[PDB]
C-alpha cells in the first residue's frame, strides 16, 4: 500500500502537473542527474559535534573564542535556497550530500540546515516532513554541528505562542538533532529573547544570540544605531545566557570599514565568541566577511559557490581561497568544496521553476534595507499587484515607511509589516505626510505591530502614527499575555482529527502550524512517502515509457514504468498504466483541467 | 533615399527577423527612460591643459580614489556578448556628463566592440565614439588597445598600428589602455610610442596571473610585476594598470601588490578586474586602502560575475572614507536604473551563468572568454563535460610552461583544451591551427619561451622565430592599399573607414555594403532593430538632427508571385509600399 | 461613392464572412464559369414576338395547334429553388440569358420569377428581384419570361386585399413577365378568380394551374379521380384561362396516369396543356414522355446540371428522347450541353447550399412532400433534433394529411401539414391522439375551403372558441389605401421610391425595408461575382467588376491588418491603379 500510494502521486502529477511547477519554466530536457561524489571509505574525523558533546556549551564557546583559525558555517542547506530558490530545495537532494560534507570537510563549524522557511515550506509545498529531513542530515554528518535559525518570539511559527509551547518546541528540536540555535528578535528586544535562550540552555545546546544589524555605525547622521548600541546589546546577551554572539546582517548592509571597527569592539566588549552572518545583495559581502576575519571574528557563514551571490551568502569557496595560507587559514580543502559545489549546481538545475529574475549586485540595498531573503518575494507581490514598472517607487517607499515607523530593525515578521505599508503607499498612491496627516484603511499587520504584537522597539512607537491607525496598546511581552496551552487535550484534538496516535515531533509541528500540518498528514495518507522520489519525478511525474528507480526504504527498490495514459473517461478520471517491478498496475486519478 | 533605405530594413526584419535574435530568447512581453539630468569641467579639461605626463602626476597626488566606468564596453562585452547598441550607449552620455562629472573616464571603445558593432549590429563604431564625445566633453574617453593586434584579429605591420592610433586619437579617445597577451614589453613599444606621439594618455597594462603569495608558483612573484612596472615606465608610460582579466587577484595579494608597485614607480596605478570569484569588490577595496590611484567598476545593472564588481556598492563603501571618490549615490543608482531597463531589451544575449565561481582559481579563464568557451563546448557536444574542459584548460596552461592567458593567447589554450577533451587525449598523449601558430612565435614570446618538447612535435618540420612578429611583416603600401578598398567600394572613403578596413577588411567591406542597402540603422531604437515593428505599432526615429520620422507599420501582405512580401507603412502621414523577399 | 460602398462590402466579408456561408462547406478550390462563345450575330424572333402579335387568347390556340412539344426551362427558378435553397444569384442568371436567347430561340419560356426567388434575393442575397427580371429581359428579348404566382398571395407570405394583388400583377407585367402560372394551394377556383382577371387586364398569358395529388388510377383513393381534374379544367377555362397547367408539385403522377389524364383533359377543353413536375421519384422523365405521347402541349424541364431528384427531370435527356420523332422539340443538344456545363460551373460556387439528398425515393408516393419543401422539412427536423427519426416524420405527414380529409399539399398548405407532422413526432401523439399558429390559421379558413370543407371534430378542438369563416379570405380584407401606404414607405426611407419598390414593400414590408438600408450602405453588390460576394478576396486576388456597362473597376486586395485598438480592421485595396484603405469592425 506504500507502493500503491506512491503510484497514485506519480499518476496524479503525471496527469495534472504540480501546482508550483505547472505554469513556470521547466529544467533543460538533457540536464544530467546530480552525481554524489566518489567515497574513499575511511571513517569520519571527529569534528565539532564531538567537541560540543564532551565540553558542554559554555566550554565549547570558550574553545571557539581561543580558536585561531576562522570557523565556517555552510548555509547552502537553509539560507542558500531560501534566498535563491524560494526554499524549495528537497530532502532528497539535501540528505544525499550530508555524508560527503562529513567525510570531506570535517573542519567545518556547522551546517545551517533548519528553521527559517524550511519548516512550513517543506510540508506546505514539498509534501515532506522537516523532522525527517533533519534526522537524515544528522545520520549523515555525525561529526559536524547542525545549526538552525530560530525566532525568539515565534519558534519557527507565524504567530506568537504561549511559553510552554515555545519551550516544548526547543526541547523537540534539540532531541531531533539541532546543536546550534541561532536565535533572534525582530526588534533586537532582549526581553523577547529570554524565554528562548533559557530553553536552549535547559536542553544543554548552543545558544547563539543574534543582534540584527541595520543602518550604518560609521554614519553620524544615523545615531540610533551606533557602535555602543551593538556592544551594549552583546553585553546584555552575555548576561542573558548566550554562548555565542551573532551579527545577523539580514539585508547584507555592513560595509568593510564598519567591520574593522565592529568586530574589534565586540571582541573587547564580551568574552563570547562572535559569529558573522550576512548576504550579498550588495555584491561586496565577501569584502565585509574578509574584514571581519581580519578583525578576529571567530566564525562566518558562507554558501557553496553554486548557491552563493546576490540575495544569498557570498561565495564560500572563494572566501576560503582568499584565506588560504593566512594566519587564520580555515583548514578546508578547495577541491572538495568545488566537488560539492558541482553537485549543488547539478542539483540547482532541477529547480528552474523557482529561479528569480535578479541579474546582479544592487547598491540600492543601502537605500531600502530589504532583507536578502525577502527581496524576491516582495517584488513578486509587487507584480501581483501590478506595479512591476514602479518597483523603485516601492523601493523608495519602503525606505520612507522605515523612517516614519521610527527607523526600525526590519526582519521577519517586522519586515512584512513595512512591506505591506510600502505596497499600500504606492498603489493607494499616498505620501509620508498622508500617513502623518490630521485630516486610511490600515493593513492588518501594521495595526497589529503598533498595538504591540511584535514587541517593543528601543524607544517605543510613534505616538501620532499609532492613534490614527489603531484601541489601547500593551507594552509588555506579547507571549506573557497568551494563556499557556493545555498540551494534553490539544494532543487529543489532533489525534481525534487524524484518527491515530501522533508522535511528539508531529505534535510539535501541529502546535507550530496546525492547518499546514493537518493538510500534510492527510496528503501523506494518500500519497505515501513521496519525499523519497527524486526531484524531477516529484515535480513532473514520468514521461511516456519512462522508467524510474525509487527507494521505498533503505534496501528496497521499486522499478516503475509509465506504459500508457488513457483518455479522460466518461466519469472524469484518467487511467495511468504502470509496470511495478514487472507486474501490471492500473491507477485511476482525476482529470483536473 | 535614407528614409526609404530605413523602411526597407525595418520591413526585412519585421518579416524575416534578425539572424542573431530570431532563435534566442525574447525580452519580457518598458522603454528605458533617460534621467532628466552647463557641464562641470572635469578630467577631459584637466588633460587638455596639463598634457599626458603631468596629468599622470596629477592622478598620482590625488587623495580621492578615481573611478573608471566600464559599463559601455566591458560590462556588456562580459555579460551580453558585446551587443550593446550605439542608440542605448549614446543617450546616457549626457547624463554621465551632468550627473557624475567627477569620474576619471568612461571605458566605451576597444576590444570586441569594433569588430561586433559592424559585423553583428550593422553600426559604425566611429559614429558611436563621436556621439559619446559630443555627450561627455568633460570626461576622458577610454579604449582598450591591443599592442600588436590593434583591435584586429591578426598582427599588422608597424605602420598600420601607427595609423590606427592616429585615427583613434582624432576620433576622440583620451585614454589608451594597451596590453600585450604575454606581457611582452618589446611588442608593446610600437603602440606606446604612437600614443605618446599623439600627445594622448598611454596606460601600459600589466596582466595579472598566478598568485604572488603562493610560493609553489614562482614564475609570477612580486618582483616580476615591479620589474615590468619599472620597465614600462622606462618604455614611456603615463599610467600603469593592473589588468586582472581572469578575476584572480586576492585581497591579501592586493594589499602587498599596490604598496610594492607605487614604491617601485612614480606613475599612478589603475586597477582593472573581473568579479568571477564573487569576491573582486574586496580586492578593489584592498587596492584602494593600499593607495591605488584609479579603479574600474561597472554600473550595478551590468556588474558582477564575469563583469566588473558593483560600482554603486564600491563607492557606497568608500563614502565618508579619507578616500571618498566624491560620487553621488542617488545618481549612480538612477543611472543603474537606466541600464536595467536597457539590459532587459537584450534578453537574447544573456548567458546561463548563475553566480560566483572559485573554479576560476583553477582554470584561470578570462571573464570575457568564459561564456564563449562554454557555448563552444556545447557546440561540439561537450556541454556535459564542462568541468573536464575546465580541468583541461588548467592542465594545458602548465604544459605551455605556465603562461599569461588573455586574447589571443586565451583562444589557443581554449582551442587546445577542447581537442584534449574531444579527442579524449591527455598531456602525456593532429594539433589545431592556432596552436602551431602560437608555438611558432606568432602570438609573441614568453619569459622562458616555448617548451622544446612541445615545440618539436607541434611544428613537425617548420622553424620557429623569436623576434617581434611585426618586424617580419613589411611596411604596407597604405597609398595603394587605399586604392583597392576604393575600387571594390566604387567610392572615395574616409580615414576612419580606411582604419576600419585595415583592421577588418572583410567585416568592413560587408558593412559598407549593408550600410548602402539599409542606410543608418544605427538610429533605430533596439526593440525595433531586432524585431521590426508589431502590427499597428508607431515609431519615432531621428535621421537628421532636427528631423523626426513617424513610421507606422499598418499591415503586412501575403507572399507574392516573385516570392516578395509587401509591407504597408505610413511615413509622416504618407503611405509607402516596401517589398522584401520571404527568406523563410 | 458607388465604388466606395462596394469596397466596404468586400472589406467586411473578407474579414467577417457571409452569415449564410460562414460555416457551411466551401467550394472546391481547384473553375470560373465561362459564358459560351458568341458566334451568330443577331437573335431570331421567338414566342415573345408571336405573343406580341397574337395576344394571349390567340397565342394559346397557337400552342394547342403546334405539333412539336414546347419546352419551358426551369433552371432559373424551380431548379435552384429545389437544389440550392433558392440561392442562385442575378450575377450568374443574367450572364447566361443572351446565350439562351442566341442558342435556344425555340424555347417556350424561361421560368425565372416568383416561387421563393422574390424575397430570398433581398432577404439572403442583397439583390433586387426587379433588377434580375430586367436583366433577363434585356438578355432574352425573344423568349417568354415566366413566373410562378400564388394567386391568393401573389409572391407574398400572407393573404392580401384584392387591390394589393392587382397592384403587384400590374407592375409584374411592366417588369417583363409574359406568362403567369397562377395556382391555388387548395385548388379553389374562387381564390384564383381575382388574379386570373388581373392577368387578363394586362393582356398577358394567364396559365391556370390544377395542382395534382393522389393517384387517379387508384379506385380506393377516390376523392381525386379523373372527373376532379377535367372539371377543374372546364372551370378555369370559363374562368378566363389562356392555358391550363397540371402542377405536379411533388412528382406524384406516374406514367400510366399521364397517358389517361392528358388525353382526357384535351378532350375536356379546347385550351393547350402545360405540365410541370418534380423528379424526386426518379421516374418523372417517364411521365413527361408519356405526356408528350398523349399530346401535351408543353412540358417543364431543367438544365442537366440542375436536374433530377427534387428538381425537374433532365431537360437534355428529355430532348434526346424526343429527337427525330414527330413531336421533336427542335432544340440543339450541343447547345443544351454547352449551357448545362455553364450551370455546372455556376453550381460549384454554391457548395454551401447543397443538401445531402442522395438520389430517387419511391417514398414520395407515401408522404407527398413537394420537391420544393422536402429539404426545408428535413432541416427543420434537424433543428428540432429529429434527424435519426426522419421516416416517422414522413409517415406522420401522410397520416396528418388523411386527418384533414385527403387534401392538396402545396405552399402554404404543405407548410401547415409539415408543422403538424413535426409536432406529432416531437410531442409524440397519434392520429386518434389528435382526433400551432399555422394550423389554427388554416382551420379557421385563413387559407381557403377544400372540396368538402374541413373536418368537424378537428375544427372544434383546434380553433377551440374561435368561430371560422368559409368565404374567400381577401373578401374579408378591406381595400388597402395604397396612396397613404406609400407615404409610410417614403417617410421611413426619407426618399421617393419607384412603382416596383412600392410593390416589394406591399408584399414584404419588413424584408424590403431591411434590404433598402443594406443597399444605401453597401451599394450594387449584385455586380460582384459569386465567389467574391460570399467570401471576399484572398490576399493578392484581382477582381473585375462592372459598376456600369461601360466602366469596369479593377479591385485588388493587397493586405489586411490586425485589429486596431478601437476594434477596427483595415483592408488595403488598389482600385483601378490607386491605393484605398477601408476600415471595418471585427464582428467575431
Ligand atoms: Mg576563535
Ligand atoms: Mg592619487
Ligand atoms: Mg400543341
Ligand atoms: Zn540570512
Ligand atoms: Zn576586462
Ligand atoms: Zn415546382
Which CATH number characterizes residue C492's domain? Answer: 1.10.10.60
Neighbours of B473 (CB within 10 A): 14
Nearest-CA distance from B568 to chain C in Å? 8
Indicate if the alpha-carbon torsion angle C151, C154, C159, C165 is positive or negative. Answer: negative
CA distance A253 to A257: 12
Residues 6+ apart with CB under 8 A from B234: none
If asked whether residues C344 and C361 sit together in one domain, one would say no
Element (H, E) at B334: helix B329-343
Of A354, A369, A391, the domain-final residue: A354
Alpha helices in B136-184 (DSSP H): 158-170
If asked whether residues B23 and B108 sit together in one domain, one would say no
According to DSSP, residue C67 is labeled S
B329 in C contact zone (CB under 8 Å)? no
Report the domain count for chain A: 4
CA distance A467 to B544: 61
If asked whether residues A395 and A272 sit together in one domain, one would say no
Ligand 2 centroid to B332 CA: how many Å?
22
What dihedral do alpha carbons C496, C500, C504, C506 form, nearest 10°? 70
Neighbours of C513 (CB within 10 A): 16
According to DSSP, residue C308 is labeled S
Q: From B272, B284, B232, select the one nearest B110 (Cα to Cα).
A: B272
If asked whether residues B373 and B318 sit together in one domain, one would say no
User: Is the residue at A45 inside a domain?
Assistant: no
According to DSSP, residue A312 is labeled S
CA distance B35 to A317: 39
Strand partners, C452: none
Resolution as reported, in Å: 2.8
The shortest CB-CB distance from C558 to any of B535, B561, B566 is to B566
Of B519, B534, B551, the domain-final residue: B519
CA distance A509 to A124: 12
Chains with 3+ CB–CB pairs under 8 A to C are B
Burial of residue B231 (number of CB atoms within 10 Å: 0-12, 13-18, 19+): middle
Element (H, E) at A310: none
Rounded to an integer, what is the distance from CA A15 to the centroid of its chain? 32
CA angle A507, A510, A511 (to 5 degrees): 90
| Phi-psi category of residue B573: left, alpha or beta, with phi > 0 → left and psi -120 to 50 → alpha | left
**Could you tell me whether strands B66-69 and B105-110 are parallel, antiparallel, or unpaired per DSSP bridges?**
parallel
Catalytic residues of A: 79, 248, 412
CB B161 within 8 A of CB B190: yes
**Could you tell me whether strands B66-69 and A583-590 are parallel, antiparallel, or unpaired per DSSP bridges?**
unpaired
Tell me, what CATH number does A106's domain have? 3.20.20.70
Strands (E), C283-373: 298-301
Which residue is it, cell 528605458? B32
CA distance B239 to B294: 10
Tell me, what CATH number does C438's domain have? 1.10.472.90
Output b/e per residue, B258-287; b: 16+ Cβ within 10 A.
Answer: bebbbebbebbbbbbbbbbbbbbbbbbbbb
- Cell numbers linked to A536: 524531477
**CA distances (Å), A109 to each of A48, A299, C469, in order?**
6, 8, 112
According to DSSP, residue C475 is labeled G
Which residue is it, cell 558585446? B82
Write out the binding residues of C for pyruvate: 77, 81, 150, 411
Q: From A551, A534, A553, select the one nearest A542 (Cα to Cα).
A: A534
If asked whether residues B508 and B537 sit together in one domain, one would say no
Chain A residues in contact with B325 by the CB 8 A cut-off are none
If asked whether residues A321 and A215 sit together in one domain, one would say yes
Ligand 5 centroid to B67 CA: how many Å?
15
CA angle B517, B520, B523 (to 5 degrees): 145
B273 in A contact zone (CB under 8 Å)? no
User: Is the residue at B42 inside a domain?
Assistant: no
CA distance C8 to C255: 54
CA distance B38 to A224: 40
User: Is the residue at B48 inside a domain?
Assistant: no
Nearest-CA distance from B535 to chain C in Å? 6
User: Is the residue at A72 inside a domain?
Assistant: yes
If asked whether residues A305 and A410 sit together in one domain, one would say no
Output b/e per residue, A432-461; b: 16+ Cβ within 10 A.
Answer: eeebeeeeeebbebbebbbbbbbbbbeeeb
Q: From B229, B249, B248, B247, select the one nearest B239 (Cα to Cα).
A: B229
CA angle C127, C131, C136 (to 5 degrees): 120
Q: What is the 3-state secondary structure (H, E, C) of C107-158?
A: CCEEEEEECCHHHHHHHCCCCCHHHHHHHHHHHCCCCEEEEEECCCCCCCCC
Q: What is the 3-state secondary structure (H, E, C) of B383-413?
A: HHHHHHHHHHHHHHHHHCCCCCCCCCHHHHH
Q: From A435, A424, A437, A469, select the one nearest A450 (Cα to Cα).
A: A469
User: Is the residue at B469 inside a domain?
Assistant: no
Neighbours of C71 (CB within 10 A): 22
- Cell numbers linked to B60: 598620482
**Taking the CA of residue A95 as centre, how many other CA atoms within 13 Å lie in the half-sphere pointing to its CB?**
19
Q: Please indicate whether, in this complex, the C-beta atoms of B560 and C540 are within 8 angstroms of each other.
A: yes
Chains B and A touch (3+ CB pairs under 8 A): yes
If asked whether residues C106 and C118 sit together in one domain, one would say yes
Domain with A586 in it: 1-30+529-593
Rounded to an integer, what is the distance from CA A306 to the centroid of its chain? 18
If asked whether residues C561 and C413 sit together in one domain, one would say no
Neighbours of C462 (CB within 10 A): 19
CB B239 within 8 A of CB B203: yes
User: Is the residue at B451 inside a domain?
Assistant: yes
What dihedral do alpha carbons B400, B405, B409, B415 form, nearest 10°? 70
**CA distances (Å), B392 to each of A216, B94, B427, C430, in order?**
46, 46, 9, 95
Tell me, what CATH number does C582's domain have? 3.10.600.10
CB A16 within 8 A of CB A592: yes
Indicate if the alpha-carbon torsion angle C343, C349, C351, C353 is positive or negative. Answer: negative
Give the 3-state secondary structure of residue C584.
Answer: strand
Burial of residue C565 (number of CB atoms within 10 Å: 0-12, 13-18, 19+): exposed
- Cell numbers linked to A329: 587559514
Q: From C90, C95, C69, C19, select the one nearest C342 (Cα to Cα).
A: C95
**Could you tell me whether strands A299-302 and A71-74 are parallel, antiparallel, or unpaired per DSSP bridges?**
parallel
C561 in B contact zone (CB under 8 Å)? yes
Neighbours of B241 (CB within 10 A): 24
Burial of residue C456 (number of CB atoms within 10 Å: 0-12, 13-18, 19+): exposed
Neighbours of A558 (CB within 10 A): 17
CA distance A543 to A540: 8
Which residue is it, cell 532563435? B23
Q: How was this structure determined?
A: X-ray
User: Is the residue at B35 inside a domain?
Assistant: no
C479 in B contact zone (CB under 8 Å)? no
Which residue is it, cell 547624463? B95
Q: Please indicate whether, in this complex, the C-beta atoms of A283 and B313 are within 8 angstroms of each other.
A: yes
Chains C and B touch (3+ CB pairs under 8 A): yes
Q: Please indicate whether, in this complex, the C-beta atoms of A283 and B275 are within 8 angstroms of each other.
A: yes
According to DSSP, residue A364 is labeled T
End-to-end Cα distance, chain A: 27
If asked whether residues C345 and C362 sit together in one domain, one would say no
Neighbours of A333 (CB within 10 A): 12
Catalytic residues of C: 78, 247, 411
- Cell numbers linked to C157: 407570405
CA distance A585 to A7: 9
Q: Gaps (C–N > 2.5 Å) in chain B: which residues precede them?
A: 29, 37, 429
According to DSSP, residue C35 is labeled P
Alpha helices in B23-179 (DSSP H): 43-61, 76-80, 86-99, 112-119, 125-135, 158-170
CB B539 within 8 A of CB B550: yes
The shortest CB-CB distance from A290 to any of B282, B309, B387 is to B282
If asked whether residues A235 and A90 sit together in one domain, one would say yes
Residues 6+ apart with CB under 8 A from A125: A20, A88
Q: Please indicate whether, in this complex, the C-beta atoms of B568 and C572 are within 8 angstroms of each other.
A: yes
CA distance B244 to B229: 15
Chain B residues in contact with C556 by the CB 8 A cut-off are none
CA distance A74 to A79: 9
**CA distances (Å), A582 to each of A528, A530, A547, A565, A569, in order?**
21, 21, 11, 18, 26
Nearest-CA distance from A59 to chain B in Å? 33
CA distance C536 to C547: 17
User: Is the residue at C38 inside a domain?
Assistant: no
| The residue count for chain B | 584
Nearest-CA distance from B567 to chain C in Å? 9
CB B390 within 8 A of CB A338: no
CB C84 within 8 A of CB C119: no
- Cell numbers linked to A82: 531560501
If asked whether residues B270 and B325 sit together in one domain, one would say yes
Phi, psi for residue C283 in degrees, rounded to 5 = -130, 5
Burial of residue C355 (number of CB atoms within 10 Å: 0-12, 13-18, 19+): middle
Q: Would you report the helix, strand and coil content of chain B in percent, each value rounded to 5? A: 50, 15, 35
**Could you tell me whether strands C273-277 and C243-248 are parallel, antiparallel, or unpaired per DSSP bridges?**
parallel
Amino acid at each position: 500500500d506504500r507502493a500503491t500510494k506512491l503510484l497514485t502521486y506519480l499518476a496524479d502529477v503525471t496527469v495534472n502537473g504540480h501546482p508550483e511547477a505547472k505554469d513556470r519554466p521547466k529544467p533543460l530536457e538533457n540536464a544530467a542527474r546530480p552525481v554524489v561524489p566518489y567515497a574513499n571509505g575511511n571513517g569520519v574525523k571527529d569534528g565539532t559535534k564531538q567537541l560540543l558533546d564532551t565540553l558542554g556549551p559554555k566550554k565549547f564557546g570558550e574553545w571557539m573564542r581561543n580558536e585561531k583559525r576562522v570557523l565556517l558555517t555552510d548555509t547552502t542547506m537553509r539560507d542558500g535556497h531560501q534566498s535563491l530558490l524560494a526554499t524549495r530545495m528537497r530532502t532528497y537532494d539535501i540528505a544525499r550530500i550530508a555524508g560527503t560534507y562529513s567525510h570531506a570537510l570535517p573542519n567545518l563549524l556547522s551546517l545551517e540546515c533548519w528553521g527559517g522557511a524550511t519548516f512550513d515550506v517543506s510540508m506546505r509545498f514539498l509534501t515532506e516532513d522537516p523532522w525527517e529531513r533533519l534526522a537524515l542530515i544528522r545520520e549523515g554528518a555525525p561529526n559536524l554541528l547542525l545549526q538552525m535559525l530560530l525566532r525568539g518570539a515565534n519558534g519557527v511559527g507565524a504567530t506568537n505562542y504561549p511559553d510552554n509551547v515555545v519551550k516544548y518546541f526547543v526541547r523537540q528540536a534539540a532531541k531531533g538533532g539541532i546543536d546550534l540555535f541561532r536565535v533572534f528578535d525582530c526588534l533586537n528586544w532582549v526581553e523577547n529573547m529570554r524565554v528562548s535562550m533559557d530553553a536552549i540552555a535547559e536542553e544543554n545546546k548552543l545558544c547563539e544570540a543574534a543582534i540584527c544589524y541595520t543602518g550604518d555605525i560609521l554614519n553620524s547622521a544615523r545615531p540610533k544605531y551606533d557602535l555602543k548600541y551593538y556592544t551594549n546589546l552583546a553585553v546584555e546577551l552575555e548576561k542573558a545566557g548566550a554562548h555565542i554572539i551573532a551579527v545577523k546582517d539580514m539585508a547584507g548592509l555592513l560595509k568593510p570599514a564598519a567591520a574593522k571597527v565592529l568586530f574589534k569592539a565586540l571582541r573587547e566588549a564580551t568574552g563570547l565568541p562572535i559569529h558573522f552572518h550576512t548576504h550579498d545583495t550588495s555584491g561586496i559581502a565577501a569584502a565585509t566577511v574578509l574584514a571581519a576575519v581580519e578583525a578576529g571574528v571567530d566564525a562566518v557563514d558562507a554558501a557553496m559557490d553554486a548557491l552563493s551571490g546576490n540575495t544569498s551568502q557570498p561565495c564560500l569557496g572563494s572566501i576560503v581561497e582568499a584565506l588560504s595560507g593566512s594566519e587564520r587559514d580555515p583548514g578546508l580543502d578547495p577541491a572538495w568544496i568545488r566537488r560539492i559545489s558541482f553537485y549543488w549546481e547539478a542539483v540547482r538545475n532541477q529547480y528552474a521553476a523557482f529561479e528569480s529574475d535578479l541579474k546582479g549586485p544592487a547598491s540600492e540595498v543601502y537605500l531600502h534595507e530589504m532583507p536578502g531573503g525577502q527581496f524576491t518575494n516582495l517584488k513578486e507581490q509587487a507584480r501581483s499587484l501590478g506595479l512591476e514598472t514602479r518597483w523603485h517607487q516601492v523601493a523608495q517607499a519602503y525606505a520612507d515607511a522605515n523612517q516614519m515607523f521610527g527607523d526600525i530593525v526590519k526582519v521577519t515578521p517586522s519586515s512584512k509589516v513595512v512591506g505591506d505599508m510600502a505596497l499600500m503607499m504606492v498603489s493607494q498612491d499616498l505620501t509620508v505626510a498622508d500617513v502623518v496627516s490630521p485630516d486610511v484603511s490600515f493593513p492588518e499587520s501594521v495595526v497589529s505591530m503598533l498595538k504591540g504584537d511584535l514587541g517593543q522597539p528601543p524607544s517605543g512607537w510613534p505616538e501620532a502614527l499609532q492613534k490614527k491607525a489603531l484601541e489601547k496598546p500593551y507594552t509588555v511581552r506579547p507571549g506573557s499575555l497568551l494563556k499557556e496551552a493545555d498540551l494534553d487535550a490539544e494532543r487529543k484534538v489532533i489525534e481525534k482529527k487524524l484518527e491515530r496516535e501522533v508522535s511528539d515531533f508531529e505534535f510539535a509541528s501541529y502546535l507550530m502550524y496546525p492547518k499546514v500540518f493537518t493538510d500534510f498528514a492527510l496528503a501523506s495518507d494518500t500519497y505515501g512517502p513521496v519525499s523519497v522520489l527524486p526531484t524531477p519525478a516529484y515535480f513532473y511525474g514520468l514521461a511516456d515509457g519512462e522508467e524510474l528507480f525509487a527507494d521505498i526504504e533503505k534496501g528496497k527498490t521499486l522499478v516503475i514504468v509509465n506504459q500508457a495514459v488513457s483518455a479522460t473517461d466518461s466519469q472524469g478520471m484518467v487511467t495511468v498504466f504502470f509496470e511495478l517491478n514487472g507486474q501490471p498496475r492500473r491507477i485511476k486519478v482525476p482529470d483536473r483541467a
